[PDB]
């Protein structure tokens, strides 16, 4: 078995013309073993994912703070202990509205 | 999209010979469109027995310290952690400490 801790992985300062103010870990790559891909995403006050949607299904389970959900036509504040399934090709995207740090985990079936 | 609150599903208690201690919520399950994902509060004292299972697992500590049982001694690792079981391979995990502990399992 392979333990990790997944404040050790070195986050990815994210800025481009689609994300704001984003950081991301990935604990379990595209090329590892697992079946799985797993990122930790930590969501900078103010930043932004943009509406976007992708032909792979998205499931997310905030760790800490209030996730701004953006959804096609509209959007859904959640907190803490909520999971989200993302349905394939569904546009989505995400903002922290909050002057704090918010952090959520991304998983995707390979 | 499906937004849930995980503390609001039910959890089922675990009670059998290599399982004692253990809630579980089922936050997907295989009815369920996703492509299985769980939560599990170990109680203090709460113990998954050696165990094993052909598929692989996932885990992530949400809450506390969670020793880890593997085929070579125990490790304990904390909130923030995450483990990568293989196919086949014996694990369980135990709670020794006096407060809740809480962890995601994956399924693929």
Known sequence: MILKRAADVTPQKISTDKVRGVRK???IGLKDAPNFVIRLFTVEPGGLIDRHSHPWEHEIFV?????????????????????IFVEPNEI????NDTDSEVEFLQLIPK
């Open 63 to 83: 760790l800490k703070g209030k996730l701004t959900v953006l959804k096609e036509q509209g959007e859904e504040t959640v907190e803490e202990g909520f999971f």
């Open 25 to 27: 870990r990935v604990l």
């Open 92 to 95: 989505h995207g995400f903002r």
